[PDB]
């Protein structure tokens, strides 16, 4: 109200409005879904065209052979954060001969976002990220909020109407978690989850964006006719 | 360092500091440039609210950037010096690295770049100055006349005016400049420029300065009497 001018000002009830407004830009962003078994992790992103003459904004960025995220909100902020992840995944590889843990990527994202919340002149990141990875402790899904809050989950969704997919995944939990050594079934369950966050529009060939990583599967993004299979 | 964003956007997509800079230029004494077939004439108002001045040593409104290019202005005089010094330095830097004097378009584009930078650098306000930059390209006999403004946009002009009552003298030039036949001679060109200032100036005394730039580094400021003859002929041809 009077306490929303910049990030360095608490409200009288202990709130940081600039952070809550940045959180707002995520709700306005298109829907994206994450879910995992014990063997594979899957990103399903609804891409959003400006109009019929325009392309559908790419939501899924690859970070390493074993890790990559999906974005909702300011795409230029998902570029800056993904680029930072690419470096940390890369620094771990070059210096320690060590694939960077999904858990430690979360901790590093969290701490980068935080510095932009406690300092004058900056601003919070205006994007939410879903990170998936296979590492030395198996399949992992992380939800990143630009408050700096990161959470390890079995499944989740961010963006407009995400709450449909997040209820469906809360019901299906015991089913999809048991989809081991079957990628196409885990993607189905991802595509069926995002469907619960659709209204008027349905999943078309240039609309849908899917990723998968797993036991013997490099993080690979399927766009266009590749995903016709799953429509 | 002082980092403050002084030139920012407003809810209706306006940069008010750039627009208030244009207001400083409106307030400035008038300036006109008229390009003939084989010359460009710069004409500049001198407000007669200052008498007991010393006209030998008072900064003249037309500045030589190089031997073939001049810069006149409207706006804050103190601002105009910084632009003239930056242009005169770039002019020598170009000679030293390209073994060639700047083109009039290159010098204009440089000064316009400098004005633009001061509209999205922290700690700085825009220049309160618009410029006419006139002259000839090395070994070329085609006249050049360019105008810059605080925002940093620049453009070529057959003829143009800037400063107070430039609306009135642009009106004049718009009906009295024929693109199919520009002032063939120096005489014709200086006559049309003095005429255009006599729409706004007041007295045809020490209120008008005229500088003639011809090809191949030939630049000459007219004297009071030489101008005063053009003033005498224009009003004797008008008594009709």
């Amino acid at each position: 109200n009077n306490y929303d001018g910049d990030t360095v000002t608490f409200s009288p009830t202990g709130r940081l409005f600039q952070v809550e407004y940045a959180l707002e830009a995520i709700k306005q962003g298109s829907v994206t879904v994450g879910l995992r078994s014990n063997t594979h992790a899957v990103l399903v992103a609804l891409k959003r065209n400006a109009d019929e003459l325009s392309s559908y904004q790419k939501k899924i960025i690859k970070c390493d052979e074993h890790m990559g995220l999906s974005l909702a909100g300011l795409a230029p902020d998902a570029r800056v954060l993904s680029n930072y992840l690419r470096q940390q995944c890369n620094y771990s590889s070059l210096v320690f001969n060590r694939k960077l843990a999904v858990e430690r990527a979360g901790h590093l994202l969290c701490d980068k976002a935080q510095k932009n919340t406690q300092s004058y002149g900056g601003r919070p990141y205006g994007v939410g990220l879903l990170i998936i990875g296979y590492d030395k402790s198996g399949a992992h899904l992380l939800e990143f909020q630009p408050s700096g809050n990161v959470t390890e989950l079995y499944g989740t969704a961010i963006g407009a109407r995400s709450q449909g997919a997040k209820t469906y995944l809360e019901r299906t939990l015991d089913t999809f978690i048991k989809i081991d050594g079957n990628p196409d079934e885990l993607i189905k369950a991802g595509v069926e989850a995002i469907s619960q966050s659709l209204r008027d529009e349905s999943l078309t060939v240039d609309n849908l964006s899917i990723a998968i990583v797993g036991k013997d599967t490099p993080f690979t993004i399927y766009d266009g006719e590749a995903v016709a299979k799953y429509i | 360092g002082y980092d403050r964003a002084l030139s920012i956007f407003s809810p209706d997509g306006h940069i008010f500091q750039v627009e208030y800079a244009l207001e400083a230029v409106k307030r400035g004494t008038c300036a006109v440039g008229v390009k003939g077939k084989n010359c460009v004439v710069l004409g500049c108002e001198r407000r007669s609210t200052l008498k007991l001045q010393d006209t030998r040593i008072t900064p003249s409104k037309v500045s030589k950037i190089d031997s073939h290019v001049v810069l006149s202005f409207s706006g804050l005089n103190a601002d105009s010096r910084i632009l003239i010094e930056k242009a005169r330095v770039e002019a020598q830097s170009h000679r030293l690295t390209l073994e060639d004097p700047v083109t009039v378009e290159y010098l204009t584009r440089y000064v316009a770049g400098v004005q633009q930078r001061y509209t999205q650098s922290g700690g700085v306000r825009p220049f309160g100055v618009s410029t006419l930059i006139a002259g000839f390209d090395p070994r070329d006999d085609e006249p050049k006349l360019y105008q810059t403004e605080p925002s940093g946009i620049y453009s070529s002009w057959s003829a143009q005016t800037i400063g107070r009552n430039s609306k009135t003298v642009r009106e004049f030039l718009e009906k009295n400049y024929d693109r199919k036949e520009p002032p063939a001679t120096v005489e014709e060109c200086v006559k049309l420029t003095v005429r255009s200032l006599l729409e706004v100036v007041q007295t045809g005394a020490k209120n008008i300065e005229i500088t003639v730039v011809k090809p191949d580094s030939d630049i000459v400021a007219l004297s009071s009497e030489e101008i005063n003859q053009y003033v005498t002929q224009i009003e004797q041809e008008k008594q009709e």
């Binding site: 003459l53 002149g121 | 920012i8 633009q116």
Partner: protein, 235 residues
């Protein structure tokens, strides 16, 4: 006053949204991508009849396989063009090849959010970036001051844009010839331009694999305007 990098309660950057208004005020620019090339057209919009309209440079070369039209505070486009050109030539130096149109656009857009209390404010200009590359063929991009860029089959920016975009929505198909796209740009310019369209207040350009980026002579554009008037009189 308030931060330059400040979020509105709807989760948008004020200064970014305000710059998008400046861009709406700027003269029109239209791109159309085909399989025979990309066409870029602009309204010059001279402020006076004394201004030598061919000194109005609102279509610009970045490399031989990448052109660019601008709309808004066109002075802000200079440092962006400089960056694009330096990026294209620099890539060519380090890799001995032509730089991808998407990669060039992404380098320009990387400048856009470098503002704070870096430059003092966002850019007040939108860019239509048109090029060819062996990988993704003929391409048109829109590069907003937000740091976002969308690929388009066709896109209008500037004062005419929502009127022009509605019209491009109908007219564009995947089988347009280059010659068709040229008339289509002249047509839609004439519609949304204040002054009557001629070869002195509107400029055409295209990018073809064979000939690279070519700004059209006033004479050539005048033949296409005359061809438009006759084909619109025809029915």
């Amino acid at each position: 006053d308030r931060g330059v990098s400040t979020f509105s309660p709807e989760g948008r950057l004020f200064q970014v949204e305000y710059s998008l208004e400046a861009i709406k005020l700027g003269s029109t620019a239209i791109g159309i991508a085909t399989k025979e090339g990309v066409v870029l057209g602009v309204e010059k919009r001279a402020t006076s009849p004394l201004l030598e309209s061919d000194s109005i440079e609102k279509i610009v070369e970045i490399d031989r396989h990448i052109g660019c039209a601008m709309s808004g505070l066109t002075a802000d486009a200079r440092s962006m063009i400089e960056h694009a050109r330096t990026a294209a030539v620099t890539h060519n130096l380090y890799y001995d090849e032509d730089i991808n149109v998407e990669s060039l656009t992404q380098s320009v857009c990387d400048l856009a959010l470098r503002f704070g209390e870096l430059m003092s404010r966002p850019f007040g200009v939108a860019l239509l970036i048109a090029g060819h590359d062996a990988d993704d063929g003929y391409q048109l991009f829109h590069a907003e001051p937000s740091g976002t860029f969308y690929r388009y089959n066709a896109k209008a920016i500037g004062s005419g844009s929502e009127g022009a975009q509605a019209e491009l929505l109908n007219e564009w198909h995947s089988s347009l010839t280059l010659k068709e796209a040229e008339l289509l740009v002249l047509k839609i310019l004439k519609q949304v331009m204040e002054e009557k369209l001629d070869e002195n207040n509107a400029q055409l350009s295209c990018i073809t694999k064979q000939d690279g980026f070519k700004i059209y002579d006033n004479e050539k554009t005048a033949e296409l305007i005359k061809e438009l008037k006759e084909k619109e009189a025809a029915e």
